[PDB]
Amino acid sequence: IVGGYTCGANTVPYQVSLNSGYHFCGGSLINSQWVVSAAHCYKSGIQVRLGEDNINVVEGNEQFISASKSIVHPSYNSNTLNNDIMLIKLKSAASLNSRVASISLPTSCASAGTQCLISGWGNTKSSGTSYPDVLKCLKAPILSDSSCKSAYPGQITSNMFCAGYLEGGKDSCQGDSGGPVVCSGKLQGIVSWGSGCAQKNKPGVYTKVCNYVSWIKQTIASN
Ligand SMILES: [Ca+2]
Ligand SMILES: [Mg+2]
């Protein structure tokens, strides 16, 4: 996350770190047995880490649970990143508490202008590499599809939205992939892609979760 701030330990209790020997993607806990992340984060051998703040120091509120199964969206296209969403079931149920909580799925899509919260352990420089060990946060508004489509002609589908600042300066970056974009108490997006980080007229692009609620509910209940 570039230009954001330190969230504070466990202030984003639904935030997950996917680890395959190191942190490689974020995710969101939607209930004790399931996590939603990005399909481009798919890997075999994932351990889900809950209640994290510093990812290199066991501070006491973590739960590390292995994944039993992963389900990438049936229509994920890794070339365009359309339908960039995946579900991860935990081998054991998490123990929800103040530090480990789930986030709600949306009932309707959010409007442009709505302020959201983006969080992750990704790169914090736009031009450089500095990976933080504690969770960083960024409040950013959803942009109009018009400004999103002008920035990326022929690349945005109805399953994507942009959030950020066209002036640049604040944005998600690598290491944030798969993490949450929460607006008004609901999980509305997933960090998917963008052009570099915090560049001018290049906002980050997010998976539009409100379009996958029936698929998520149907899939988790049948698995
Ligand atoms: Ca830790
Ligand atoms: Mg993240």
UniProtKB/Swiss-Prot annotation:
Its cofactor is Ca(2+). InterPro entries: Peptidase_S1_PA, Peptidase_S1_PA_chymotrypsin, Peptidase_S1A, Serine_Proteases_S1, Trypsin_dom, TRYPSIN_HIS, TRYPSIN_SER. Its main location: secreted. Ca(2+) binds at residues 52, 54, 57, 62. Subsequent cleavage after Lys-125 leads to alpha-trypsin. Further cleavage after Lys-170 yields pseudotrypsin. A cleavage may also occur after Arg-99. SUPFAM superfamilies: Trypsin-like serine proteases. It is found in: Secreted, Extracellular space. Disulfide bonds join 7-137, 25-41, 109-210, 116-183, 148-162, 173-197. GO terms for molecular function: endopeptidase activity; metal ion binding; serine-type endopeptidase activity; serpin family protein binding. Is inhibited by scorpion cyclotide trypsin inhibitor TopI1. GO terms for cellular component: extracellular space; serine protease inhibitor complex. Binds 1 Ca(2+) ion per subunit. It holds the Pfam family Trypsin. Residues 1-221 form the Peptidase S1 domain. PANTHER family: RIKEN CDNA 2210010C04 GENE, TRYPSIN-RELATED. Belongs to the peptidase S1 family. This is Serine protease 1. It comes from Bos taurus (Bovine). The lineage of its organism: Eukaryota, Metazoa, Chordata, Craniata, Vertebrata. The gene is PRSS1.
